[PDB]
Amino acid sequence: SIEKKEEVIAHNEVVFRSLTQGLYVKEVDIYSDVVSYTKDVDEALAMPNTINFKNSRKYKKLIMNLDLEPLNKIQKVIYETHLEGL
């Protein structure tokens, strides 16, 4: 008995994964080649992906690397109001 429902987006950012190694990028060099890795989603080279930050330039070389798999990490909070009768 969902009386009302609402959704909120807290974060929306891109995170990259190596196809074979299964790790997530955390650091890059001056040439923008990967230097480090982590197996933790909470610590990754996050690229903002909100409305204002689309069409970036910082990570063009990183994107074109075929070994990397971009992922849209999105965090949400949803409020649900229940009326359960008496």
What residue ranges bind another protein (CB under 8 A)? 14, 47, 49, 52-57, 70, 72, 84, 86
For 33, the token pair is 């080649």
In angstroms, rounded to a whole number, what is the distance separating the alpha carbons of residues 25 and 13? 14
Q: Using CB under 8 A as the criterion, what x/- string covers residues 23-62 for binding a copy of itself?
A: ------------------xx--------------------
For 55, the token pair is 């069409």
In angstroms, rounded to a whole number, what is the distance separating the alpha carbons of residues 22 and 3? 42
How remote is the C-alpha of 76 from its chain's centroid? 12
Which residues within the stretch 61-80 sit at the binding site for a copy of itself (CB under 8 A)?
A: 69-80
Selection from a copy of itself, another protein, none that 47 binds (CB < 5 to 8 A by kind) is another protein
Closer residue to a copy of itself (CB): 35 or 74: 74
